[PDB]
DNA sequence: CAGGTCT
DNA sequence: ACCTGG
């Protein structure tokens, strides 16, 4: 009872609810969908992971988001701790309002979105997000999850153990910048991406001003933050857009990939007009992202998340 | 060859 | 131009 991953039924005294409709947040569409790679459904409908340097288990009913924290004497999450969950899910951003806007300007969105409510963006840490998305180059969601887990196990601080899972926090820049990290990361199957992690951890810390430079790209404009991220090894345009959208408070960023081409073409009959080339290219990908920004508005990347979730079936 | 990044 | 999965 007192050992292991908790469930709402098994230890009801250690949970606290946050008012949050299922239409504002679907955990099963947000937490496993390749935004974060570090949440696990360890019991049915119960998602466990590291959030604000502690381990949480989250589950929901129709009107409540139920939360528990593993810290020495076990107790409910305090008020300040629940705000970190609200902050992580960005719950002040009302989806009801966004879905209404997107629907009003896009009848295709109106048609598809009703089935896929509660899709929102997590407000991720920029370090974690950066190095996760560096591991996603030439890769799929299954292997990426594994690489990130091993990376965190090897180089991240031990938090606590629940059942047979030892939770680790995401590694610091210092740990990823350290001697022989590439070789160690290669032993963990990351391949050529091992170099990129090491090099980008070193470039941030030793060439760019460290953690502070990255964190202050939150305050900088989208265009600035994107340009700044591209100088890092393993970070091209797509990767930078993902980081901008997921970790640097740029809701207008629209990461363009072949998947977005398929949507644009099949669902909006989109073709590049200004650009010369017909297919994907840096010129045409920039044009596509702009199309959806003008269509959807300042939260275009959140809209994309909904269509991405809907296409996934 | 597909679909990203580096210079 | 360069890289690695399917
Ligand atoms: C698509 C070319 O990949 C860029 C990675 O370069 C090797 C350093 S990790
Ligand atoms: Mg991430
Ligand atoms: Mg290193
Ligand atoms: Mg780069
Ligand atoms: Mg908008």
Residue numbers in the entry: 9 to 79, 83 to 324
Q: What text appears in the publication on this structure?
A:
Both the recognition of damaged sites and initiation of repair by BER are performed by DNA glycosylases, lesion-specific enzymes that recognize specific nucleobase damages in the genome and catalyze their excision through cleavage of the glycosidic bond. Among them, 8-oxoguanine (oxoG, OG) presents the greatest challenge to the DNA glycosylases responsible for its repair, due to its unique combination of structural innocuousness, extrordinary mutagenicity, and chronic low-level production. The question addressed here is whether the 8-oxoguanine DNA glycosylase responsible for oxoG recognition and repair in humans, namely hOGG1, interrogates DNA in the same way as the functionally equivalent bacterial enzyme MutM, despite the lack of an overall structural and sequence similarity between these two oxoG repair enzymes. In summary, we present X-ray crystallographic structures of human DNA glycosylase hOGG1 interrogating DNA lesions in their intrahelical position, achieved by covalent trapping of an ordinarily transient state in DNA recognition.
On the basis of this screen, we have selected the Y207C variant, because it crosslinks efficiently but is substantially distant from the active site of the enzyme to participate in the catalysis and does not interact with DNA in native LRC, and crosslinked it through the X8 linker to the minor groove N2-exocyclic amine of 3′ guanine of the target nucleobase. In both IC and EC structures, the target G•C and oxoG•C base-pairs are unambiguously intrahelical, with a root-mean-square deviation (RMSD) of 0.244 Å between the two structures, in which the RMSD superposition was performed for all atoms. Similarly, N149 rests on the minor-groove face of the target G•C (in IC)/oxoG•C base-pair (in EC) and hydrogen bonds with both bases. The X-ray structures also reveal that, in EC, a water molecule bridges the oxoG to its 5′-backbone phosphate so as to attenuate the repulsion between them. In the EC structure of hOGG1, the longer distance and the bridging water molecule between C8=0 of oxoG and the C5′ and 5′-backbone phosphate, respectively, could help bend the DNA at the target site, bringing these repulsive functional groups (i.e., oxoG and backbone phosphate) close to each other, thereby initiating base extrusion.
